[PDB]
């Protein structure tokens, strides 16, 4: 019930959620676990965590390079599940969402994938290259194992898509800020007020805005636009990349950034 509980608490506090993304195992397993503890300590309300994939087609160069770093450290999905179990054992209530590509979910059986997610205490799974039209076995397996399947509401969404996303998704609704792929260098729009409004009309899971969110101003703006919160990936990953030789400075600058981004979610 972790997302439901989070949004209820945030609502009571008149706060948006701030949700960082990192790649699991970037730049190694031990440093990644410290990064994630830093993000939480600095005020992350939830996590979105990528499992390294060979060909991440929804990602721009910054997160492509995060994936490549994890691979250079020998990170596999099995090691990611060990990390996730350790994260949950430390942090019982934070919502944990995975960013997956379809092949990694399909590989050893869709059902088996969601069952593993349940065993380690994952709350949600977003499969980036499975649109609602192809989602049936993924959403069925997710709900059978008490995992929230996350769906995307793009800026080009029509009414049929809004209704499907509202119906099929759980946890949160992903409100895409723009077309294209992940990247801090491509700033998205303000949340589409009409889309936020239609999602609320249709009783969709609360919206988190993502793609191109890299500054406290954008977080504040998402909240004001009526989104429940915002996700930032590339901006966080840039701080890892810049500080590979300076792990202590890396954690200091991650704490500073996350704290600032979270402070902007307070209304």
């Amino acid at each position: 019930e972790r997302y439901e509980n989070l949004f209820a608490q945030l609502n009571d506090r008149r706060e948006g959620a701030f949700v960082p993304f990192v790649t699991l195992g970037d730049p190694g397993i031990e440093q990644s676990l410290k990064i994630i503890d830093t993000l939480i300590d600095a005020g992350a309300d939830a996590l979105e965590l990528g499992v390294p994939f060979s060909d991440p087609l929804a990602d721009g160069p910054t997160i492509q390079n995060a994936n490549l770093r994890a691979f250079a450290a020998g990170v596999t999905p099995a090691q990611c599940f060990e990390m996730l179990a350790l994260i949950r054992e430390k942090h019982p209530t934070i919502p944990i969402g995975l960013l997956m590509y379809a092949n990694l979910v399909f590989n050893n059986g869709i059902d088996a994938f969601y069952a593993r997610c349940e065993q380690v205490g994952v709350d949600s799974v977003l499969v980036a290259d499975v649109p609602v039209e192809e989602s049936a076995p993924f959403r069925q397996a997710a709900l059978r194992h008490n995992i929230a399947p996350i769906f995307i509401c793009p800026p080009n969404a029509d009414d049929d898509l809004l209704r499907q996303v509202a119906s099929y998704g759980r946890g949160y609704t992903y409100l895409l800020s723009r077309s294209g792929v992940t990247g801090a260098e491509n700033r998205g729009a303000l949340p589409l007020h009409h889309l936020i409004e239609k999602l609320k009309e249709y009783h969709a899971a609360p919206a988190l805005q993502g793609f191109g969110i890299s500054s406290p101003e954008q977080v504040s703006a998402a909240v004001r636009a009526g989104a429940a919160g915002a996700i930032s990936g590339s901006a966080i990953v840039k701080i890892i990349e810049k500080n590979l030789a300076s792990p202590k400075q890396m954690l200091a600058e991650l704490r500073s950034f996350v704290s600032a981004m979270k402070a902007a979610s307070r209304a």
């Binding site: 492509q64 499975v130 649109p131 793009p154 077309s179």
Partner: protein, 393 residues
């Protein structure tokens, strides 16, 4: 919701980020509309005939079948403008792009034939063309880089991953996912998300239609088998389509065996990989135990791809088509044999199809058989590659 079936059995689908679904739905609708439009069909036929040079010859081998009971014909897609079959469907997709009010084209290329076809069609029809090509292929198929640029296309080397076709495909799709409002993605094989495997087949099917007419005229009967190389699947499905309901006609597709299947350095996912989801489709792919996509390998850039189009995976599963592999050395020998004994320089991709037909003849030289090899392109782009190797030997 689609107008046409996105699946071939279990294979195919539309496994793209949600952002791209309206674009794929738009393309499907514009194709269905075009296919019914006599004006579109007349424009397409005119370009094929008077610009591209169709119909292409069907040549009977004079020398390479001597002392056997094999009669071998070559469907001469090497004579098409641009130098390969890729030109056929590019002319069709360029006209669709215009029909949808797009002004820019994105394409991937490995052999550079698809890129050359995309650039020539963009130059003729007034589209701005950008091509992604892996850096390894920029080197081994460089004559094509020179041709694309002279025709005004922007050519973007891809250094990521294997620096070959898969990596070019990735970058083209990433680009499209931001640029679809104004750019059409001119996918250059019978693979990827629906509706591309269907569109590419329908815009390549004249290969098999002409072949059937030509062989009936010359021989008075259908071939015993038609044989085509399979990199993504376009030339092969274009040759196979009009023969699928002629159940006596064998359909043989030839994947690259690289340095040998047993080395793991090949490009033969249909027979040696496992179903997965990548590049928009559920299809056989070369993948690790953990589900990461492998890198393929072939001497020929145009077959160096670790997946394959879903209609071929379907035709294989039901037993309608058979798929085999040919190694780099077998392809090189077939290249040399065609140049010296028939005076035709074939693409190294097409040499894999010819090598398998030569095996069919040489293994059973008193078997009476009428074969057609799709000679999918000419080998000008490969002469430097092959020269180096033969001199060294």
């Amino acid at each position: 919701t689609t107008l046409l079936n996105p699946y071939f059995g279990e294979f195919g689908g539309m496994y793209v980020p949600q952002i791209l679904m309206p674009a794929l739905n738009q393309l499907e609708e514009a194709f269905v509309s075009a296919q019914k439009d006599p004006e579109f069909q007349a424009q397409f036929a005119d370009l094929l005939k008077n610009y591209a040079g169709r119909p292409t010859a069907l040549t009977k081998c004079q020398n390479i079948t001597a002392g056997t009971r094999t009669t071998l014909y070559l469907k001469r897609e090497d004579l098409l403008h641009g130098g390969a079959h890729k030109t056929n469907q590019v002319l069709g997709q360029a006209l669709l792009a215009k029909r949808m009010g797009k002004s820019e084209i994105i394409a991937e290329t490995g052999a550079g034939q698809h890129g050359v076809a995309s650039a020539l069609a963009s130059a003729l029809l007034g589209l701005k063309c950008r091509i992604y090509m892996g850096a390894k292929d920029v080197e081994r198929q460089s004559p094509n880089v020179f041709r694309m640029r002279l025709m005004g296309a922007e050519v973007i080397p891809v250094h990521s991953g294997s620096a070959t076709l898969k990596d070019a495909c990735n970058e083209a799709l990433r680009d499209w996912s931001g640029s679809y409002e104004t750019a059409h993605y001119m996918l250059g094989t019978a693979a990827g998300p629906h509706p591309y495997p269907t569109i590419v087949r329908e815009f390549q099917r004249m290969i098999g239609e002409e072949t059937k007419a030509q062989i009936l005229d010359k021989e008075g009967r259908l071939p015993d088998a038609v044989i085509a190389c399979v990199g993504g699947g376009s030339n092969a499905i274009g040759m196979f389509a009009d023969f699928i309901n002629d159940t006596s006609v064998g359909l043989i597709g030839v994947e690259p065996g690289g340095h040998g299947i047993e080395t793991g350095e090949h490009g033969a996912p249909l027979k040696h990989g496992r179903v997965g989801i990548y590049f928009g489709m559920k299809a056989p792919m070369m993948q690790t135990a953990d589900g990461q996509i492998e890198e393929s390998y072939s001497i020929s850039a145009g077959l160096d791809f670790p997946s394959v189009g879903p209609q071929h995976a379907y035709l294989n599963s039901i037993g309608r088509a058979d798929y085999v592999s040919i190694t780099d050395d077998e392809a090189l020998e077939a290249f040399k044999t065609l140049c010296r004994h028939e005076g035709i320089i074939p693409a190294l991709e097409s040499s894999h199809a010819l090598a398998h037909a030569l095996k069919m003849m040489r293994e059973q030289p008193e078997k009476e058989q009428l074969l057609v090899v799709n000679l999918s392109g000419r080998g000008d782009k490969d002469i430097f590659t092959v020269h180096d190797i033969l001199k060294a030997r």
